[PDB]
């Protein structure tokens, strides 16, 4: 019983840690990707202008 309760305690600790790390990961998510994609269409428009010229 002591071993199993220690197991459960480790369960809570690991879950809280993982939740924190994943939450930070998501908070950082979808910020640089927008800039990269916008630069992508910007270069596409520049190249199309160049080719039509």
């Amino acid at each position: 019983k002591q071993k199993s309760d220690e197991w459960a305690k480790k369960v809570e600790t690991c879950r809280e840690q993982l939740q924190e790390e994943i939450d930070r990961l998501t908070v950082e998510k979808e910020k640089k990707q927008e800039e990269l994609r916008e630069l992508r269409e910007r270069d596409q428009k520049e190249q199309e202008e160049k080719d039509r010229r």
Binding site: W7, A8, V11, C14, R15, L18, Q19, E21, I22, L25, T26, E28, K29, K32, Q33, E35, L36, L39, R40, R42, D43, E46
Partner: protein
């Protein structure tokens, strides 16, 4: 098992976020650098 079960799922999920948040910074930097070169040549061409 529950712990195991939970952990597996959770761990896997985090990886995707990493995958959707990692190995993209350098691509952004490279595109920005090429844009900088293109705009600098544009400015030089326009000055000429």
């Amino acid at each position: 098992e529950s712990y195991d079960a939970l952990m597996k799922d959770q761990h896997q999920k985090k990886q995707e976020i990493e995958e959707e948040l990692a190995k993209i910074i350098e691509e952004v930097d490279t595109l920005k650098q090429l844009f900088k070169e293109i705009d600098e040549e544009k400015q030089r061409e326009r000055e000429l």
